[PDB]
Design a protein around this ligand. Structure first.
Ligand code: VO4
Length: 574
């Protein structure tokens, strides 16, 4: 088959001389390729799960052969429970080959054709071409691997055994099933997107030019409540969103949120849009909304973490440094596991409340002096395509981006504290990064004038090129914040989906009503002054709970870290 020409990644090629980074890279490539061809593990929660599984297998394969001192492996060889029993090296001492076997085995199990019956129902929607393209990626990776891959070595075989264990234990085949789910219309209730109420999908994925059929997607409605958690030691909950349950009386907050939604996230040319050009840039920068050649948010978070890892490595040699190898293997396991669990809990809460998106909220408001029946958002960018595709929708509260970001960046902060600088674990850090480029704004990717052509490189396809923006960030606290508010700029999330409005916005004399500038744009607090302290109530439980995705993510990362990356006790699994 013709290999899809993938655009160049903005990153020092030296990074991939390190075999831990190389395998992470392979995972990211499969991430973007599967979203281009419509293969398995698409969507934010499951794409995160794939990376978590990959790095867990790598972590244990490496630390089995090169034992750590301040922590231990995720699974152990002495576990009585066969499902959690880690294989023993038994002579194998080649860490490079162990990692290769674990990574290759895991990625292959994840992305290859489900010959073992699983093709029915679960995989019955992916074309043969999708699988073929994914295979190409896997095949050339073997050839590009630093130091090569010796599939016959005992160490390689050991890595494979490790992968088998993790795959059998954590794989969730029916994770994205929506069978049986249907929206329950009403105020504050999630339903089909007014701009994309239905999709025409081919009856046969192998014949895309053939007959289509109407389809209504709902992204992983049962995943969060039924899936196996990775390293969390408890269930996490958020306060009821403004307008629902115990907080149904928070009308001032809700009304002002509608107001901020229109002004900050509307389409570019609307007279009601007050968002600045720079804010529009911040919105698109963090998107990665499953587009062609781009993938999902977990991919971007890993791209950023790769830069942090190299920027703050202990030793200069990326190729032959066990200090670096152990550092990266540990960091990525921590980060990708936190990201996986963040996906689980954000999805659990999303479908629990089933809160509607701003587009529907503003349009269906019903009050002549509050709503706008014809409003349009800036929206999730449909990069490298010529239209606005129907992307499987899901509820608004809390923001997936916000939760992912909170988890990933708080994990990075906990890991580097005392090493890059010193700070209170709940206060701004100093982990700065430079020359960070998002593929949404890289001067290469674009909004096509005609349908995407997978046999030609993106540069030879007509369209409006996305401006190349090179960013610098002063801290992981800033990254966390901007990643969260970017969704407000796109108009896909309410302010409270990110965090409590009180913690991120500038207050006025009027309660629940926040400050706007001379031209009506919403004013945010300075990043250095932001503290996620405001909590709220839940109708079904006593106590105070976090509001929005960022606080939820921070909470998940702290828990995992404090427990040193230990499996969720099987007793508390769904
Ligand atoms: O991925 V949101 O849940 O931030 O659209």
């Amino acid at each position: 088959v013709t290999p899809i020409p993938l655009p160049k990644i903005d990153e020092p090629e030296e990074y991939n001389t390190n075999y831990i980074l190389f395998w992470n890279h392979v995972g990211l490539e499969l991430n973007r390729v599967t979203h281009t061809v419509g293969g398995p593990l698409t969507g934010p929660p499951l794409s995160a799960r794939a990376l978590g599984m990959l790095h867990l297998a790598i972590h244990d394969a490496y630390f089995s052969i090169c034992p750590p001192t301040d922590f231990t492996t995720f699974l152990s060889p002495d576990t009585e429970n066969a499902a959690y029993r880690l294989p023993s090296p038994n002579g194998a001492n080649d860490a490079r080959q162990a990692v290769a076997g674990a990574a290759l085995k895991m990625l292959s199990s994840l992305y290859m054709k489900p010959v073992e019956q699983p093709n029915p129902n679960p995989g019955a929607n992916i074309s043969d071409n999708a699988y073929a393209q994914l295979g190409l990626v896997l095949d050339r990776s073997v050839l590009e691997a630093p130091g090569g891959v010796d599939r016959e070595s005992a160490s390689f075989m050991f890595g494979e055994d490790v992968a088998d264990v993790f795959f059998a234990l954590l794989n969730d085949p029916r994770g994205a099933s929506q069978e049986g789910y249907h929206p329950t219309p009403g105020r504050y209730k999630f339903d089909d997107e007014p701009t994309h109420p239905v999709v025409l999908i081919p009856v046969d994925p192998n014949n895309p030019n053939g007959p289509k059929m109407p389809f209504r997607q709902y992204h992983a409605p049962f995943y969060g409540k039924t899936t196996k958690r990775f390293a969390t030691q408890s269930e996490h909950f958020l306060a009821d969103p403004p307008g629902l349950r115990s907080n149904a009386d928070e009308t001032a907050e809700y009304d002002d949120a509608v107001r901020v939604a229109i002004a900050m996230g509307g389409a570019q040319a609307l007279n009601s849009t007050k968002r600045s050009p720079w804010q529009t840039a911040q919105g698109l920068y963090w998107a990665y909304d499953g587009s062609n050649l781009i993938g999902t948010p977990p991919r971007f978070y890993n791209q950023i973490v790769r830069r942090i890892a190299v920027t703050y490595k202990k030793e200069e040699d990326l190729a032959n440094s066990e200090v670096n190898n152990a550092d990266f293997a540990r960091l990525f396991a921590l980060v990708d596991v936190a990201c996986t669990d963040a996906g689980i809990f954000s999805w659990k809460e999303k479908w629990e409340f089933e809160f509607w998106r701003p587009l529907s909220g503003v349009r269906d408001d019903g009050r002549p002096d509050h709503g706008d029946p014809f409003w349009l958002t800036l929206g999730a960018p449909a990069t490298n395509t010529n239209d606005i595709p129907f992307k499987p929708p899901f509820p608004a509260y809390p923001s997936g981006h916000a939760t992912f970001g909170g988890a990933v960046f708080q994990m990075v902060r906990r890991y580097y504290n005392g090493r890059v600088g010193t700070w209170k674990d709940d206060e701004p850090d100093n982990i700065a990064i430079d020359m960070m480029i998002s593929e949404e704004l890289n001067g290469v990717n674009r909004d096509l004038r005609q349908p995407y052509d997978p046999t030609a490189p993106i540069e030879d396809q007509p369209g409006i090129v996305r401006t190349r923006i090179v960013r610098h960030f002063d801290s992981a606290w800033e990254l966390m914040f901007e990643n969260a508010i970017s969704r407000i700029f796109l108009g896909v999330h309410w302010r409270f989906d990110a965090a409590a409005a009180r913690d991120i916005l500038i207050p006025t004399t009027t309660k629940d009503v926040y400050a706007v500038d001379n031209n009506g744009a919403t004013v945010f607090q300075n990043v250095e002054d932001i503290r996620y302290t405001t909590r709220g109530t839940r109708e079904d439980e006593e106590g105070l709970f976090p509001i929005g995705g960022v606080p939820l993510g921070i909470e998940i990362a702290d828990e995992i870290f404090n427990n040193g990356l230990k499996p969720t006790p099987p007793e508390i699994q769904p």
